[PDB]
């Protein structure tokens, strides 16, 4: 065969927000091969950091209407969608933001951590008014790939939080849009070859080089399918035998709980206390007899 | 348990394992009794003797043993209770009247 | 307790037919319990005992 | 698939006989002298000791080639609880 395989070549980073990456040497077809079925899975898959749990002091819920504030409450929470976060090491961070006086409280009002890495400090958070107007507000940050509303967290997790934990749903998604081309690449002897570039646009928290090495090894590993393949008795307690109302009498003097606490013992240990053929009849029946010794007892 | 049961299991004891170096010591311990106790409770019922009952079908299968197979007797010493030929043969002459090698000629 | 049929009864009215006894057919009941009350067998009974 | 995935190397880079006396299980030296120490059957003899029951006056270092290797094919243990040994029926011969 005369195959070629290719090779990553080109990172021109043109923003922060907007890039390009180029790609070569592709064969003919290979480019609508290895243009698109990134794509797809470049659209979706991507883990990143997003806010989640937003709650303020003093504000019991979403509805609600805190003063000093210019905004309404629903609304900062949709202000608060849009931060980019560049978290390193962990998957939970809570962050915590402190304001006094007139001035727009901004994604420059945090209390920065190590590994965080506020992409978009610039941002508009919220705009307070008033002289004593002091906002503070304890976010939980986390990090994931994929799509959940607030509604998904809800049934399913039963444990119930304290009042006041106002959510937002989960924008994980750290791509916004992107593009790609088909041109020729300059080998010389195949002037058939051709070259690819994929210019990527999307929000903070990405190096793109990285964006295109996780999206090979989504795909290169749903191939592995392909390349490859083609005594209830023990805890019964006492009262169950309608047992005789003088050995019951006794049972319950020799603190015995379990029929297992009893074959613990054997019929030696029973014979002390006044007022074994009784026994020695009924256990012959169901399946049990004496003298029986246990280990690795209790398993509660 | 009465005694009319052991001896029935004494000889239900011994027919299975004659093939093997058996002794009557081993017999004791799975009996559990002593190695006297054996030879007094065999006159009771058979009038015979325990010590060389278990030597006597040592003779009584290699009766056929020998009379079956191709086997010669240098190694029926070593295993069916002797060191040596000169004692296996005689044991047969106070038994059945016959010396071992004309045993088989007969037809 | 008037299961099966239509006429409740007392103690005595049991005594009639049956026999007269008055604290041994009260603690017929109490014992009626005691081998009846085991909440394991009668764990069907207590879905019945959360309604 | 596997042409693919090489275009992306350089971008990922009970029993029956188990319920019946020692004299029915095609064996002779492992029936006669278990039901003299109380154990007529398999039953007590998967719980009980054979460094007692071999030591008494019928067993000894010879059984346990006529009771391991039974409790090789039927599975049970030393000292084993047993689920529901024993039914109405109790008899010998």
Not at chain 1, 43 to 71: F, N, R, W
Not at chain 3, 5 to 32: C, H, P, S, W
Request: glycine share 4%; proline share 4%; net charge negative.
């Amino acid at each position: 065969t005369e195959f070629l395989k290719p090779r990553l070549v080109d990172i021109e980073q043109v923003s922060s927000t907007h890039a390009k990456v180029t790609l070569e040497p592709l064969e003919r077809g290979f480019g609508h091969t290895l243009g698109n079925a990134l794509r797809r899975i470049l659209l979706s898959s991507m883990p990143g950091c997003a806010v989640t749990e937003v709650e303020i002091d003093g504000v019991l819920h979403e509805y609600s209407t805190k003063e000093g504030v210019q905004e309404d409450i629903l609304e900062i929470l949709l202000n608060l969608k849009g931060l980019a976060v560049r978290v390193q090491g962990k998957d939970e961070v809570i962050l915590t933001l402190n304001k006094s006086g007139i001035g727009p409280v901004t994604a420059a009002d945090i209390t920065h951590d190590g590994d965080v890495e506020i992409v978009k400090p610039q941002h508009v958070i919220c705009h307070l008014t008033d002289e004593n107007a002091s906002i503070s507000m304890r976010i939980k940050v986390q990090r994931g790939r994929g799509y959940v509303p607030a509604s998904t967290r809800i049934h399913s997790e039963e444990d119930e939080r304290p009042i006041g934990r106002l959510l937002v749903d989960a924008c994980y998604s750290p791509v916004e849009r992107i593009a790609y081309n088909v041109e020729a690449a300059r080998v010389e002897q195949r002037t058939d070859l051709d070259k690819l570039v994929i210019e990527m646009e999307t929000n903070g928290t990405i190096d793109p080089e990285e964006a295109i090495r996780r999206a090979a090894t989504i795909l290169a590993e749903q191939l592995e399918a392909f390349v490859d393949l083609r005594d209830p008795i023990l805890l019964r307690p006492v009262d169950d035998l309608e047992l005789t109302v003088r050995s019951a009498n006794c049972l319950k003097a020799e603190a015995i709980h379990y029929i297992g606490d009893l074959v613990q013992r054997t019929e030696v240990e029973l014979l002390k206390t006044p007022n074994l053929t009784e026994i020695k009849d009924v256990l012959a029946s169901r399946g049990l007899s004496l003298g029986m010794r246990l280990e690795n007892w209790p398993p509660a | 348990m009465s005694h009319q049961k052991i001896i029935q299991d004494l000889i239900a004891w011994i027919d299975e394992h004659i093939d093997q170096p058996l002794n009557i010591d081993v017999v004791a311990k799975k009996s559990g009794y002593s190695k006297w106790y054996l030879q007094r409770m065999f006159r009771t019922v058979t009038h015979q003797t325990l010590g060389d009952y278990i030597r006597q079908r040592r003779l009584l299968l290699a009766a056929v043993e020998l009379r079956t197979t191709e086997r010669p007797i240098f190694d029926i010493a070593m295993d069916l209770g002797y060191v040596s030929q000169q004692t296996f043969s005689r044991v047969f002459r106070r038994q059945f009247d016959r010396t071992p090698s004309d045993y088989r000629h007969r037809l | 307790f008037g299961i099966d049929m239509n006429t409740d009864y007392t103690l005595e009215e049991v005594g009639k037919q049956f026999d007269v006894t008055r604290e041994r057919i009260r603690q017929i009941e109490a014992k009626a319990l005691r081998k009846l009350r085991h909440p394991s067998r009668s764990e069907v009974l207590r879905s019945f005992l959360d309604d | 698939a596997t042409i693919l995935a090489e275009q992306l190397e350089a971008f990922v880079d009970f029993d029956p006989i188990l319920l019946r006396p020692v004299d029915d299980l095609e064996l002779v030296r492992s029936a006669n002298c278990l039901k003299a120490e109380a154990i007529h059957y398999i039953g007590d003899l998967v719980q009980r000791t054979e460094v007692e029951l071999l030591k008494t006056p019928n067993l000894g270092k010879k059984s346990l080639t006529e009771i391991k290797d039974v409790l090789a094919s039927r599975g049970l243990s030393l000292g084993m609880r047993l689920e529901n040994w024993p039914p109405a029926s109790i008899a010998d011969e």
